[PDB]
Each structure stands twice: as C-alpha cells, then as structure tokens.
C-alpha cells in the first residue's frame, strides 16, 4: 500500500480506502463489518467512509461497534461521516447549522469515536447560504469535533464560493471532495474540478471506482442473481443502466473488457487503477458486499506497470469521454 495526500493538506491516505454504502447493514452484517474492516487495515487502508443517510444510521452504528470491538490506535485510522439526509423532517436534512451540528454530534456517537477526522456535506444544499454552512463547520473544528471538512459532488461555483467564504470571514477552507469518478464518469474531476487543484488544493476521494461493479465485468452478459443491480430497493439503479446511455456504456465495457484481457489484467483491475493513475485522485474508496471482493479489490494494486501512458490513450479512444480542458482565446 502507497498513501497519498488529501489534495495539498497534510492528511495521508491509504491510495485505496473502504466505504460502506449499499452494503453496510443490509448485506454486510456487523460480523462481516468487522471481518472486512479488519481485512482492509491489515492491508494498510487507512480511510473508513461512512454517512449518516446510510441504512438511516445503520452503517455508521455498525461501523462504531465494529471501531471499539476491534480497538485500533485511534491515531492510525481516519474515519467520515457525511452529513445531508438525516430523515424527513425539514430540520433533519440539508446543510442548515442546525442539521450540519445535530448529524455531527449524533455521528460521534454511532461512531463511538471522540472526533471526526473528516466530515463531509454529502450534497450541495440550493436552500442553505454556503456561508452558513462553512460557519458551521468552523465551530465544529474549533470545538474539536472534526479535524478536516469538505464536500461531494458540489460544482466548481460552489467550492469556489466555500473558498471564498472561507478566506472573507476567517473561517477554516474546505479539504477535499468525495465525487464519483470510474473509466465512465469523468466530469466533474477532469473536468469542471480542474482549476481547483492548482487554486486551492482541493483533495479527492473518488466515489464508485467499478461504476457499482459495472466495470468488473460482472453485467456483460446479464444481471447475476447476487449482485448490486439486483438487490431490492435497487431498481432505480439497475433502471439507469438499463437506459440507452447506459446500454451503450455497457457496450464500452465490452471492449475495456478486451483490452484488459490483451493486457493479462482483470477489467476490475485496470479499472481501479485507471483511477489511480490521475495524480489529482488521493484516493480511490472501493466497496466491497463480501471478503473475496476486498481481497480481489487490493490484488489491483500489483500491476501498476501494466498502466501505461498507451494503454490510457486507448481507454480514452474506447470510451471518447475525456473532458475538454480549459478554453483558450
Ligand atoms: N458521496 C457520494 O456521493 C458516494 C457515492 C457512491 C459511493 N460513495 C463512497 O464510495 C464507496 C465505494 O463506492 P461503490 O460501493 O459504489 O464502489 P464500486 O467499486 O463502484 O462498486 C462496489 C460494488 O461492486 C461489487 N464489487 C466490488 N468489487 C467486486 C469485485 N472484485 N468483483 C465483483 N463485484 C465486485 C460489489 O457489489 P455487489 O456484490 O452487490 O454486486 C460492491 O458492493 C462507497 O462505499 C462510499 O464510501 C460515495
């Protein structure tokens, strides 16, 4: 295992993370939570993603109790939470001070852990001053609450705004940012995040990298029985996939998945480290509903060298999705 900053801060993750959303819960039970939490650190992944809309708390529950049963150093992990859906009364969602403050305190206690090392606004909130929100995460870093705070799947106008913010009212900036970026979602880290990097070093810790196991292969030639797209509550999901921008995704997969056979690599494989070979990515958080999953997930990481320069321009002649740089008169 290689670690790498989260963006310009000092913070050091483990280039692969664990996340626990889908799973945690509902086909990770706390046992397996704490077999594949366990498995992970062995490893030397050393970021555990949870927040507090998954399974309504669940996760994270199941999370804390696997933390205290197996009693690491609590210097040598870090662990999130992400705050926007805390049920569905209108002070139990968004990024209100009230809502960003109560999914706080009620994440150290599901977490059972004394501070969060990062907490992040799971959406952007369009009915919420940004300034309000960057206020109140300031009061949490001064009670010493959290230590690092950031966002998912915001747009550039509205980092660029936090940053501002931030620096107008001498509050403490954003970190980092959680989007979802894999071989088939390129926007926002390419693209619309790109002036950000040298502007504010902003972190990244990548959301899907297999595209929900998309880009394991595993969906070519159908929908296995035991598989995300199948598990109830999911069809919305295997309904996106199942649109004609998703069939002709699926078909792109096909020929990624030629390529990783000439290449002597699992497609699962060139596929995380696809993710890893942008420097702008500081770490790739895999998900995993099972033990061989994890451990199929971490063998990626023995063929870096198979990742050339050639082999990302032919991914990118595949998929023609590479987002245009900036524009110049
Ligand atoms: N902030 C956000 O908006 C956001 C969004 C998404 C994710 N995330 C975070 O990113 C983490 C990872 O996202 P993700 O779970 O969507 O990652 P992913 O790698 O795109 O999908 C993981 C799923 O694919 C299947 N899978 C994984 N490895 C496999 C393998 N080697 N062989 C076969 N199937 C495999 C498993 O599902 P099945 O076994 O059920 O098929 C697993 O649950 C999440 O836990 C969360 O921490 C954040």
Redesign the pocket.
Known sequence: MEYRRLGKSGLKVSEFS??????FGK?VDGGDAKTLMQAAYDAGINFF???EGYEQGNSEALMGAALKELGWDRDSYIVSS?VFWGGSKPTQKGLSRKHVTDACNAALKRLQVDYLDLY?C??PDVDTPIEETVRAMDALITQGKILYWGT??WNAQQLTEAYGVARAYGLTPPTME???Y?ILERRKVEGDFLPLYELFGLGTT????????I??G?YLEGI?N????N?PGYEWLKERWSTPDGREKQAQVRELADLAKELGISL?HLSLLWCLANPHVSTV??????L???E??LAALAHKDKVTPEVMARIDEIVGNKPAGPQRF
């Open positions: 664990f996340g626990s959303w889908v799973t086909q993603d949870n927040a992400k992040f799971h959406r998912s799947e959680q989007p979802q894999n990548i959301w899907s990298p297999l595209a929900s196991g880009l394991t595993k296995p035991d598989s995300r797209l598990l699962t958080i895999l998900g995993a509903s099972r061989s999953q994890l199929d997930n």
